[PDB]
Design a protein around this nucleic acid. Structure first.
Lengths: 108, 82, 180, 106, 107, 95, 97, 98, 80, 109, 97
DNA sequence: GCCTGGAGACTAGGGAGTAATCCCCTTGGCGGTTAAAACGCGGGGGACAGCGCGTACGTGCGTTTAAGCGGTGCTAGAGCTGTCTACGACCAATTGAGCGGCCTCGGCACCGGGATTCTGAT
DNA sequence: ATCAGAATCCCGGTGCCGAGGCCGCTCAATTGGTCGTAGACAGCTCTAGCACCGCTTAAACGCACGTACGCGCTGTCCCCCGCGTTTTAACCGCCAAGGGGATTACTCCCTAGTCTCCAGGC
């Protein structure tokens, strides 16, 4: 929503700033920095047997994926509690960013 | 609710430790303060014991390693080897 | 008596022969947990029937959590079928069930102190260590867990028959120490 | 015939083993003959004292078997041995049953 | 010795296609592109570590799980996710969620 | 080597002479073994330090006696010194 | 119904736990704590049972002695309830902090 | 009227002055006489090296200063400023000296 | 004798000032004299033990330093 | 026979490797002493000496002095947290104490 | 007669001082304090290495035991930089004769 | 009857005991004198007792949950053993580094005087 | 705010003794060689540490409620602090004497080292 857009803007500004030094160190003009940033911004704006899991591929925009870190994992027979950290999630073509999350899972 | 491992030192455990120490009445922040103190103490003793272990080229922390770690700091412990 | 114990968990072992490269098994298979440093095995679970397979390096696999013995072997068949799907070729051999655990309830209060006093050399009771008393029998070699509520745990049995006679044997002793 | 050094000194502790541990423990290049005898006598006396007080504590609790609780009572109840073992923890020993007077009911 | 985890993210996905389009154009060398991706991973990790305040809870069935190479991969079913904006809890019912995880510090 | 080293036999002998009809737990045995080892190590270290202070190279009865005086409290030091000198006298007499 | 007067049950626990010798911290959460702490120093460390038991005995002894000093210095302030400033005072005097 | 300083101003001035300086705060002949009387109880006709009495005095003054720091801290803990002997007894109890 | 009174009220007051004390009760002086007497008896006992072990009749500075070292009060500035 | 070269010069140290080796051998610490042990120990002693002497020279500069006195060593030790931890049970003669007044004792308006 | 030699670390402390502070001097009492400090840290590290060799049933004190004793006694930052200096010195000494 | 430290005998070298010497350093005394301790007083401010209030902590009760038990698996890793080789003890000759003594001059200390700061009453 | 007195800081001058450098010497560190043994390393064994299960049940936890207590406020009185005066003994210097600590030299006993038997534990 608002918070996700603001944080994404911090990532954009910080990365574009930090990256330029290596580009200049090797002879790459400052025009490329602008080109990469503008096109990158445009794409963000517009975009917003059964056992064998080896044949797994990104379904597309529809799929919901969590990239996060795990503090620790607890073991229970039915409940599967798990503390998670530093995660960005995308559900129903919307982006929600968090520092920590708690997931409780059920072992059918 | 899932809690941190340091929170695994539950409030009744700290209260029992206080009762053995003679503490009739306990505040509400004594639990967090005691968890922090215990974490610091355990960090020091386990760091010393893991150093003793790494010197012996072992991958398992031995009870004698903990006894030697405790003995240098003067907090001697009887009952796990001499 | 009028009670028959119900088997809940079957602990079985199967050896597969050829040594396994666990990394491929962990990557290809689902519902698998392989932390190499802590433990030299992958923990694998299947929803139906609910079981837990521990697959080791040498090929020996351990199946637990099975309600019945035929259910346990069927679960082993499913594990063998999926491991064949992984890409490792192995043949099942030396199937045996070393331990099965049975739970029964007499539904009547019993006095643990009398049982401890009568069989003090034979069995040991320690209230603070455990609210139950362990009961070790020379014949049959079935460890018994006794409780004040009257829940009796049967463990240590190769086959169902062995626990069944052991429960039948324990029932008069339990009746003797009945309350009121 | 051969007589052990403990019987010569009149001790139960092994003078020979104490001599070995003194010679191998890197305390000096030379160890005198009287040193393991004296050290074994001192160790045996301290053992006898602690075990006497622990047996008294075990009789007080109507027990016939010294447990760590009785060793803790022996150490913490005697003043001299509490000064000696003031920085020492005894496993499964507990504490002295001491309550502060201010906390007692009015 | 630095985590490659956030490459799959939508923001990360946007960067990888943009660099790929740039490489197709040929404006910059590919090794430099890899360098930029590594910088992105480092920057995104610290900003996630400190610049976010939102709180959320996932309540759901657990279809499949996996733990290989110190990576925890949970597939969670019929999640009841309650997310609060930093600027009220909002209940979203999502059919399937993939949880990809990694330990804070790898050995 | 597989063989280990413990003071259990001697502690048992002392227990029977002091209190004939009292046992001792195995945990209490580990505690007594570590106590004997710790007190031995303290006295031997103090005696070694003593011999180093006086530029000597030998641990004699005098260094053990002084280390007992220094480490043990007054009543314990007095009685342990009396015991040690009695044992050394008996040992030297029998030679 | 009947309610016990405040402080009677606290003294009952004091007498009970000062008469006992058992461990007052549950062994499994303490073991998990030890392993977590040990992870920061060296990874993939295994722990002997007796090692964790010795660690727990030392931790309970240290915390009981700290609580005794905390209670003494709280009584010194003419109080009964112990606050974290009492622990900080006791630790400061002991030289821990 | 003569000039007067409010109570505690000069006490603080002495605190700053003696914390700034390093000389020994006990006179050396009284402390030496005390050391020799105490040593009369252990061995008679003892003689003392000058540096030995100086080392004893440095150790004693450092011990007393650290004890008064702990005494002041545990007096302030009781929301007080004046130190009484019960503060000293608390400090010696916590340090494991009683 | 009167030598313990030689640790005068101003000397104890100066020691408290170095310790950071702003107000001193009248009984701190006797309490401090007792504490100092106990400490000095311990340290001088150990020092005379070290002296007697060396078959000497003079308490050297090394005896005091050595005695303090095993009471954990390591002293720098007088040798060793 | 080639010209004698001190072990400290070989190790690039100022502290005496040979004297530390002889003290380790005569100190009754073990029946044998490695070759790199006095080198390592002399390096550690030189580093700790350099740390305290640098901090003491800084303290002596702060007092507008060019000699290090026990007061400067005391200030250097007690002002650094790690060194104060290492020398917590240590008493420095003629060192004084750290200037430190509790905030409750200061006057008020 | 001539007084027998009394070895001290005075000249080595003075060399290290002239290295870190080329114009700053040192009194005799401060030199005695530094000598006591070097002797104290020496006997601490050496006693720890002796106990370390005795615990692992070994009979030689090497750079390994001295390094582990430095990790044990010294605080973390001090230990890390002392280990770095000792490792650099042992490396340079082994590289040469 | 079969052993792993322990005791017995014997030898050889050196460490410790003992005796004489010297000179350092500790102990004891006198005197001046001055700063420090002791003593009296008054006041103020802090210790301490009483009160009061609300608040956080003890107590109980029902609910949940994880600690504890018991059993089993296996394999990583502790432990132990054999073998060899690098590495440290030892020894002897040498010699430069380190220590004792001596000198000398500058950092610091003591004195005194102005400038600055701080405290308390106004 | 203000001001005056008291205490501390700073600046300069003079002196003085202790630190820093030089020299002479001597003894401990260095170098070169030998040798014996500890430790590294590979290989075999087999124990116990880290998983899994599920059952049970007592312990943890959440909350309601009431009440002891902590903390803030107020009054009182007592006793510690500041200061002025008097007394005293610590400190400095100077001298003297003799005890005792350190040194050196000689001797002899005592402990390490080695080999051979042995004695309680199994």
């Amino acid at each position: 929503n608002a918070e996700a857009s603001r944080v994404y803007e911090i990532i954009v500004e910080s990365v574009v700033n930090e990256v330029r030094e290596d580009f200049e160190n090797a002879g790459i003009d400052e025009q490329t920095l602008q080109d990469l940033k503008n096109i990158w911004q445009k794409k963000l704006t517009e975009t917003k047997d059964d056992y064998l899991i080896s044949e797994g591929e990104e379904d597309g925009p529809d799929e919901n994926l969590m990239l996060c870190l795990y503090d620790k994992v607890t073991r229970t027979k039915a409940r599967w509690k798990c503390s998670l950290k530093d995660g960005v999630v995308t559900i129903n073509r919307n982006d929600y960013t968090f520092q920590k999350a708690q997931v409780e899972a059920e072992w059918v | 609710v899932l809690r941190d491992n340091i929170q695994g030192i539950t409030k009744p455990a700290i209260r029992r430790l206080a009762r053995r120490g003679g503490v009739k009445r306990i505040s509400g922040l004594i639990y967090e303060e005691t968890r922090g103190v215990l974490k610091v103490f355990l960090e020091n003793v386990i760091r010393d014991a893991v150093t003793y272990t790494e010197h012996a080229k072992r991958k398992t922390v031995t009870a004698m390693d903990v006894v030697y770690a405790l003995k240098r700091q003067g907090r001697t412990l009887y009952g796990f080897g001499g | 008596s009028g009670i028959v114990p119900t088997l809940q968990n079957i602990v079985a072992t199967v050896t597969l022969g050829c040594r396994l490269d666990l990394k491929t098994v962990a990557l290809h298979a689902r519902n698998a947990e392989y932390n190499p440093k802590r433990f030299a095995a992958v923990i694998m679970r299947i929803r139906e029937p609910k079981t837990t397979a521990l697959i080791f390096a040498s090929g020996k696999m351990v199946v637990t959590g099975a309600k019945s013995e035929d259910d346990s072997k069927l679960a082993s068949r499913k594990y063998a079928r999926i491991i064949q799907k992984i890409g490792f070729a192995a043949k099942f051999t030396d199937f045996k069930i070393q331990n099965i655990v049975g739970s029964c309830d007499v539904k009547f209060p019993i006095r643990l102190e009398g049982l401890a006093f009568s069989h003090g050399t034979f069995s040991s009771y320690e209230p603070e260590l455990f609210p139950g008393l362990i009961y070790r029998m020379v014949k049959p070699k079935i460890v018994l867990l006794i409780f004040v509520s009257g829940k009796i745990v049967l463990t240590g049995a190769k086959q169902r028959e062995e626990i069944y006679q052991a429960f039948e044997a324990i029932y008069p002793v339990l009746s003797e120490f009945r309350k009121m | 015939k051969a007589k052990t050094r403990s019987s010569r000194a009149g001790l139960q502790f092994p003078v020979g083993r104490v001599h070995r541990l003194l010679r191998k423990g890197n305390y000096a290049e030379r160890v005198g003959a009287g040193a393991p005898v004296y050290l074994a006598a001192v160790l045996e006396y301290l053992t006898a004292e602690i075990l006497e007080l622990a047996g008294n504590a075990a009789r007080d609790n109507k027990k016939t078997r010294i447990i760590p609780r009785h060793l803790q009572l022996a150490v913490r109840n005697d003043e001299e041995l509490n000064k000696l073992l003031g920085r020492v923890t005894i496993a499964q020993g507990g504490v002295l049953p001491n309550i502060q007077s201010v906390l007692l009911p009015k | 010795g630095y985590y490659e985890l956030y490459r799959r993210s939508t923001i990360g996905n946007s960067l990888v296609d943009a660099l790929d389009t740039l490489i197709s154009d040929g404006r910059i060398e590919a090794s430099l592109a890899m360098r930029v991706l590594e910088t992105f991973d480092k920057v995104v990790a610290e900003t996630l570590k400190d610049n976010t305040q939102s709180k959320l809870t996932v309540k759901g069935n657990l279809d499949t799980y996996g733990f290989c190479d110190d990576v925890w991969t949970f597939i969670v079913k019929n999640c009841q996710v309650t997310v609060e904006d930093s600027h009220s809890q909002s209940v979203i019912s999502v059919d399937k969620l993939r949880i990809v995880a990694c330990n804070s510090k790898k050995s | 080597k597989t063989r280990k080293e413990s003071y259990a036999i001697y502690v048992y002998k002392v227990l029977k002479q002091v209190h004939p009809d009292t046992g001792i737990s195995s945990k209490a045995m580990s505690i007594m073994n570590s106590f004997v080892n710790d007190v031995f190590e303290r006295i031997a270290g103090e005696a070694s330090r003593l011999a180093h202070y006086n530029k000597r190279s030998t641990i004699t009865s005098r260094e053990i006696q002084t280390a007992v005086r220094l480490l043990l409290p007054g009543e314990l030091a007095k009685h342990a010194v009396s015991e040690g000198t009695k044992a050394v006298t008996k040992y030297t007499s029998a030679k | 119904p009947h309610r016990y007067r405040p402080g009677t049950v606290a003294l009952r626990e004091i007498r009970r736990y000062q008469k006992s010798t058992e461990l007052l911290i549950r062994k499994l959460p303490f073991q998990r704590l030890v392993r977590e702490i040990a992870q920061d120093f060296k990874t993939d460390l295994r722990f002997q049972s007796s090692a964790v038991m010795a660690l727990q005995e030392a931790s309970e002894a240290y915390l009981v002695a700290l609580f005794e000093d905390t209670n003494l210095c709280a009584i010194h302030a003419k109080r009964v309830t112990i606050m974290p400033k009492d622990i900080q005072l006791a630790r400061r005097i002991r030289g821990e902090r």
